[PDB]
Amino acid sequence: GAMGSLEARMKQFKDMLLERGVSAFSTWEKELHKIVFDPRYLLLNPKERKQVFDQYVKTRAEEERREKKNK
């Protein structure tokens, strides 16, 4: 219903990624502890969660890279 059903959940996830910084260039496991410390890490299933990761690391990296590699 225009951002409110699943999108919201998948949004609370994307946000969390930008909260602890799911390093757009690291291992999903290191990134685990980073977020898993929260129960919202268990929101999307291994399907919707898989996209949120590859999609986040893809767009985020391209940006933080072209700028100054961030780190």
Curated annotation (Swiss-Prot):
Write out the tissue specificity statement of the associated record.
Detected in brain neurons.
Domain FF, by residue range, is: 6-59
Q: What induces it?
A: Up-regulated in brain tissue from patients with Huntington disease.
Q: According to its UniProt record, where is this protein located?
A: Nucleus
Q: What does this protein do?
A: Transcription factor that binds RNA polymerase II and inhibits the elongation of transcripts from target promoters. Regulates transcription elongation in a TATA box-dependent manner. Necessary for TAT-dependent activation of the human immunodeficiency virus type 1 (HIV-1) promoter.
Partners and quaternary state? Binds formin. Interacts (via the second WW domain) with TREX1 (via proline-rich region). Binds RNA polymerase II, HD and SF1.
Q: What is this protein called?
A: Transcription elongation regulator 1
Q: Which residues of the full protein are shown?
A: 659 to 724 of 1098
